[PDB]
Design a protein around this ligand. Sequence first.
Ligand code: F6C
Ligand code: CLA
Ligand code: CLA
Ligand code: CLA
Ligand code: CLA
Ligand code: CLA
Ligand code: CLA
Ligand SMILES: CC1=C(/C=C/C(C)=C/C=C/C(C)=C\C=C\C=C(C)\C=C\C=C(C)\C=C\C2=C(C)CCCC2(C)C)C(C)(C)CCC1
Ligand code: SF4
Lengths: 739, 65, 46, 80, 42, 31, 139, 137, 46, 29
Amino acid sequence: ATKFPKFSQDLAQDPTTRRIWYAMATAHDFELHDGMTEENLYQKIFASHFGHLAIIFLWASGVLFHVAWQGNFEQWIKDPLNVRPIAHAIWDAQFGPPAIEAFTRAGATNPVDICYSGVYHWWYTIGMRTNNELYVGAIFLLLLAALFLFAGWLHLQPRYRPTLGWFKSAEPRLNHHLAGLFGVSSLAWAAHLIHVAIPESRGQHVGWDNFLFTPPHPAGLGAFFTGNWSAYAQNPDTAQHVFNSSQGAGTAILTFLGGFHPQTQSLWLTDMAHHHVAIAVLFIIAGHMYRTNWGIGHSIKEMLNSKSFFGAKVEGPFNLPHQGLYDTINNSLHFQLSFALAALGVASSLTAQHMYSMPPYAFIGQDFTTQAALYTHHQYIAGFLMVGAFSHAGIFWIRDYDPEQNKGNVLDRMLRHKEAIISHLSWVSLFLGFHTLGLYVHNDVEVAFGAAEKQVLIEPVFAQFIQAAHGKALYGFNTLLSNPDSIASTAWPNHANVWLPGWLDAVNNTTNSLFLTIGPGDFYVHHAIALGLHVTTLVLVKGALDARGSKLMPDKKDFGYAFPCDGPGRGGTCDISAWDASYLAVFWMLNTLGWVTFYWHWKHLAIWEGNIAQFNESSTYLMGWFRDYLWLHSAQLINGYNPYGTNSLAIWSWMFLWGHLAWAVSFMFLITWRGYWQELIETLVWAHEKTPLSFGYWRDKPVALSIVQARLVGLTHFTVGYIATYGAFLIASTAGKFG
Amino acid sequence: DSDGIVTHLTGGNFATSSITNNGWLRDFLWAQSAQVIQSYNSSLSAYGLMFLAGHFIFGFSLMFL
Amino acid sequence: MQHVFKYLTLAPVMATFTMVALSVVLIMLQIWFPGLQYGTYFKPTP
Amino acid sequence: SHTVKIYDTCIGCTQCVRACPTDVLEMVPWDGCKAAQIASSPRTEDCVGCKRCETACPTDFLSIRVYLGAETTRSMGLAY
Amino acid sequence: DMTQLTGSYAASWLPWIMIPLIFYILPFPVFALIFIWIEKEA
Amino acid sequence: MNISDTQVFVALVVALLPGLLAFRLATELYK
Amino acid sequence: TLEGQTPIFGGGTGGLLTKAEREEKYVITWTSPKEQVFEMPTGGSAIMRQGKNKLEIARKEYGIALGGQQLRAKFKINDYKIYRVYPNGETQMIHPADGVFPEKVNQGRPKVRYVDRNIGSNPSPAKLKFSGVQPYDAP
Amino acid sequence: ANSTLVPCSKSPAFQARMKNAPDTYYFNKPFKAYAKYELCGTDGLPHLPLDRLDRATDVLVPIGLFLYVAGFIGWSGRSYLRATKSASDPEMKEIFIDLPLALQSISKAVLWPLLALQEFLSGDLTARDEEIPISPR
Amino acid sequence: SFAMYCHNDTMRAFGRPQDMFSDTGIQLQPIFAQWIQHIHTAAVGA
Amino acid sequence: APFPFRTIVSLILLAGNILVAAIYFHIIN
Ligand code: F6C
Ligand code: CLA
Ligand code: CLA
Ligand code: CLA
Ligand code: CLA
Ligand code: CLA
Ligand code: CLA
Ligand SMILES: CC1=C(/C=C/C(C)=C/C=C/C(C)=C\C=C\C=C(C)\C=C\C=C(C)\C=C\C2=C(C)CCCC2(C)C)C(C)(C)CCC1
Ligand code: SF4
């Protein structure tokens, strides 16, 4: 046997190349390691989390350092609307002179990449102004990463390893993470906005050298303690304020104007400061709900196990039995990870949906390529987090769920009617797919036959009504915020609708992305998105609920989360494991996010190009998507290099084909299966043994990739090609046509 | 023409464009699909419909595979 | 001949007859009333 | 090596033993069924995991189960 | 001039050596170290 | 005005501290 | 040593490899009533001799397939034996293990890996967490 | 009230489409019907809104017509299937359509909305949960 | 065959057409097929 | 069974849908 892997003697005794492959794939599955105890499991995870945080801080330090070293931050400040931000320099020693000339742009004298992550806008808004300030932040994050790296090592030493009870104390962790990690951090950020960011946006420099004796407001802290909080809202920034200058600048630190700053077309800095102040208060209050050491507070176990509603007998909350759940979550790390991944997935989607419509950073709304990249980035990450939440939900059913301790509770009830859940999810998927596709191809045939007037064009009246209810007067509805006489708009008892005038200006502005006008084309794509959401949920839910067993395989729980099959018997059982459902769901998740990002990109492309009518008339039939979005906007991307020369889009051209190549390679791993390659490898084994002068010899016997491994490898190539191809197209079709 | 000079359908693209598969992607697939992609509202619209029909069946087959 | 009648009740044969009959009904509806649309069915020709 | 287990629902039909391509199983005397015999797996070190025995088992659910485990030279079916 | 890779940033000679070092000088010794690590007998 | 030669060299030296601590944590986790 | 004379075979590429000399090897011996043609386990046709035969094979499955599907089913030969030969010369007879074919019940054979319950009564993996015991191995 | 949707006959974009349309069976009558009855957007194409109290029959008639036909097909198949369950060889009646049985099922399915109501009231519509094959939990 | 196309794509993107496998760069003339065309043309006297 | 708790919550949720539809259809303001 070999020393590697250290955590598995079964793999260490494997005499084939499968030992190396499986060691990488199971290295972080700590629960399956040899001789793993629960206490050692939590301690190893705790130290690993310290390492991941340090990697994040080093990653942020690298972004800051390369901008301060090779970027054009200071030049970009003087003209954010016309200067291209620089990510980092290019050193590729096999470039030709045409390639060097093409990539030397944005005011640089050396080849550079154009930053599309929006960090220039973010740092500018929060008050950063010089490359020295970026450098200091980069150095600080290097030290911060070192601190967390030392902490991970320290909490592995015998005297500092926390006990299992420390990890299992849920109530103190919730209190500290709500009040301190969420609340105090939000309050500290609001302090940075008030003390640094807001003064810097008004032309006055505030730094570590003078922030101690430079009050952020003339009224001082006396107004806060006295109760004269209205003084902080007096004299807000004027509508003709110029960012990073004192011209038209107010003195208020906590306004509630709403809408957008007229010049930057982004959220008011004073509004964002008051937002994080209010959020801090709410979260600090939330952090005092659970009892830790002083008697006062709720006990989560008592709340879940409660069976009395002020004297009356109830099964539990909402008359539903929640008993025994506290031990289920507390003892299942996969159950907790499922909620954590699901919450981050929803939050990542909310980040994407709210950032393009409500840009928080100065001038970021006018960087079209940055807006497209940021929305696509956070939506795709949201899809992956959503898949992971259900993947670890299936792992929970097999590894951590026991029916005895959950007998009769709400979790057990879900498993008892899983057939009704899966069948009804199948019905919704079938209904959406049949009618959405059927109406698309109906419009295809009519438009093809010169009968575009015969299309079925269902107006999205329900969503249009919501837009009108939010203040959009375009559609002619006179309800709620679009009706100035409505009680919602007046707020009759108090008339404290100081949010409304700024909000209505941004809503009815024709040059932003706040409640974009929608028609029949938007109706059909949302129902396509609904189809994608319901099918991807169907695949994931069916895999999680059938993870423990089914009629085809009643004893699936005894075989684990990930196994190839149960053989060709009983009709055949390919892709029967719960892991295979997550494998299949990644395909549907990619397809769904593909529909989402195609819809976002094409709609904004029509707006930015001044050809909104192109989207409204062509998005109602699928040939319009194929011709006017894919074919039409690929022209510049595929001409990055040609027999006549090269331009700055050559990288996106090469990466476009590179993504297609990776996507093609995945088809090999997904279509061809193992036994074909094992027989071929055996023939190559014979050839090597009989060839003279070939003194080499394998120490690990070469074998074809396992059945599960091939599915993962093919999925990886499929996903990487999926992301690379659309990423190159998204950047090239927007940056090539705009700034 | 009358002078015996030949102008080809794609004007001699093959020698310089077919040596890269970016040239195949651009000058053959993208460029020569203009007829089928713009055939809607014409007598060739059936070919445009079947162009999408073939694309659908190819993607449809992928779940069986 | 009784075997031929039994063959005519086969599932593929009956399904083909049903689909052909429904397609015929739908086809003649397009010929007699072309351009029917939601919000137009059962309304007099203007 | 793979693990092969035989449960008490076995009816002693000897189908699993006949289907095994590496002679992992054999029939041993028993009193739990009419056939007065039950399947046994004394030679699981030679088991390749083909699951031919499970395909041949007529009982519902299976009376013989194969759990793929650590892979060796002979469990991978390697002639080299 | 734009006929060669250059750098206007400070210490522009650093990519001149770091890029060869990380991408085609050190990686083979690193692969050798990993190969020895994963092939060591118990 | 981007950072100077000294600032780049200082950052390289400072980055050694998380570099060594990363090695210590990685070896500790391997135990 | 193992006695018997090898079948007539002109050679092939499906024979033994380094594994035969380094780790282990298998030999199948049998007796036939006449000289006749059979199929080699790894392709090709060979002629088995009149007397006692001896064939070297890379894997045990080759002997089980040859003895079972060809020697018994086709040639009505039932006295075949399979040996495992180690590089140091040690030879052990492995098929049939006790002189009786495994498909025929024989007295003295113990129950191995028998679970005294139905397959549906296996405990859930949650109850055996960190105990190192699989549900099918649970008592 | 929705203002971006106007009658097609009053839409200048729709009128331009009407004149440019080919003079064939497929366009003469249909454009006349669309102009009188349909509402057109800014693109000049008919749009179908679900925000009008009036023309509610234009929504309910196609919906009710489909739901009757779809329920008729479903009830015919259900009643036929339950009739063959009492046979010795029900599988052979699914590849060989029993014409007298199918005609009886089709004739009764005309009143399927009433039949389904008494079916649900008498408890004969659904089978009990414990009498249905299910997989282990 | 195929990796030489990838070589061509990388060279063209680099702005180094002289390093491509082409008639104007590193030539790969199919001399045997060209020879057959000449033999067959000259066989009839053309 | 009449399912009291099930039908009370169901009717409250349905009443919310009807109330929103009333504003949506310009029946109330
Ligand atoms: C070790 C050693 C060794 C040796 C010696 O010793 C050898 C040899 C042979 C002979 C005999 C032949 C011929 C050659 C040719 O042409 O092809 C190749 C090429 C090349 C290039 C190969 C390579 C070679 C070597 C490896 C060299 C090395 C050097 C380097 C530089 C090192 C580096 C290091 C660093 C650290 C990185 C062969 C072959 C084959 N392979 Mg074979 N090898 C081996 C390795 C390996 C591995 C790892 C794998 C996996 C990937 C495979 C694979 C394969 C396949 C698929 C096939 C085929 O098909 C072929 C054949 O059979 O036919 C018939 N194989 N191979
Ligand atoms: C033979 C082909 C070839 C090769 C070997 C290289 C090699 C190189 N090029 Mg290059 N290039 C080529 C062709 C090639 N080029 C062509 C045809 C063009 C178009 C003209 C370019 C244009 C180009 C530009 C514009 C740039 C390069 C750069 C580079 C260097 C960085 C390494 C790299 O590309 O990524 C190798 C990648 C890795 C080693 C991965 C690192 C490991 C991480 C941890 C993986 C993590 C994955 C990630 C988290 C998941 C995806 C995230 C994503 C969604 C954001 C390297 C010297 C860059 C450079 O100079 O950098 C210094 C650069 O800016 N090249
Ligand atoms: C905070 C997030 C988080 C955490 C802590 C975990 C933790 C875990 N997951 Mg999990 N997962 C997550 C998110 C997360 N996951 C998401 C978002 C998804 C959806 C894609 C999944 C899908 C998933 C599946 C399907 C499985 C797990 C499994 C596991 C466990 C073992 C990990 C493993 O296989 O070894 C380490 C694994 C690897 C190192 C994988 C190799 C890298 C893959 C192939 C990506 C390809 C690399 C790519 C080209 C470049 C990436 C960047 C580069 C630097 C690596 C472990 C408890 C496994 C498990 O518990 O088995 C029962 C399992 O089967 N997870
Ligand atoms: C273009 C590609 C494509 C298409 C159209 C589908 C379609 C479908 N998939 Mg699917 N899938 C695909 C690729 C595709 N998949 C790939 C690549 C994967 C990864 C392996 C998956 C993985 C996957 C999973 C895991 C699941 C699905 C499911 C579904 C169904 C849910 C949607 C639905 O009911 O809509 C309605 C149906 C359709 C749109 C299908 C087309 C119907 C045709 C057009 C009707 C035409 C009738 C006509 C008379 C036929 C002509 C005659 C002909 C017989 C000769 C549907 C049948 C789910 C499912 O079965 O839910 C019920 C499910 O669980 N698929
Ligand atoms: C050209 C017009 C057209 C066409 C071709 C289709 C085609 C289809 N529709 Mg559809 N539909 C249309 C217009 C159309 N629809 C309109 C205008 C509406 C009103 C908005 C609907 C509402 C509708 C529903 C609600 C359903 C369909 C379904 C279906 C599919 C099966 C239909 C069927 O009879 O199966 C044969 C019939 C059966 C096998 C059993 C009967 C099934 C019916 C539809 C339900 C029972 C009716 C009863 C009143 C209960 C209604 C439940 C409802 C309140 C939720 C099929 C793809 C079904 C579907 O997609 O299934 C996944 C489905 O459930 N359609
Ligand atoms: C994670 C952060 C990060 C990232 C992704 C990059 C990325 C890059 N750097 Mg870089 N750099 C960083 C931080 C980072 N830098 C820091 C903090 C410093 C100051 C010490 C430098 C100093 C630096 C110089 C001097 C040069 C680069 C260069 C480059 C480019 C070529 C790669 C190279 O030669 O690396 C060189 C890297 C170093 C000399 C030190 C890197 C130190 C970081 C912190 C290590 C991070 C390790 C990571 C977190 C662990 C990954 C885990 C794994 C699972 C993925 C590439 C764009 C070259 C360039 O500009 O080419 C055009 C170049 O010459 N970097
Ligand atoms: C006999 C008629 C019949 C009836 C009443 C139902 C009823 C139902 N089916 Mg169903 N189904 C049928 C036939 C039927 N099915 C056939 C033949 C198939 C194979 C294509 C399916 C495939 C199917 C799937 C995949 C799903 C349903 C689902 C459902 C449920 C809701 C959706 C729906 O109405 O299906 C909509 C209809 C279809 C999806 C296709 C059926 C259309 C066929 C072609 C009509 C056949 C009519 C038949 C030949 C009439 C012969 C009678 C004659 C002898 C007198 C509901 C209980 C869903 C469910 O479980 O929801 C909870 C679901 O996911 N069915
Ligand atoms: C007003 C309106 C609307 C809406 C509506 C809604 C919202 C509804 C709902 C609905 C619902 C919420 C429903 C539910 C249901 C449930 C259930 C539970 C059912 C069941 C069923 C059954 C059971 C059936 C049966 C049958 C029959 C009767 C016939 C055929 C056969 C069969 C068997 C299938 C819209 C806009 C769209 C349109 C216009 C009008
Ligand atoms: S096939 Fe099944 S029932 Fe028959 S002997 Fe083997 S284990 Fe027993």
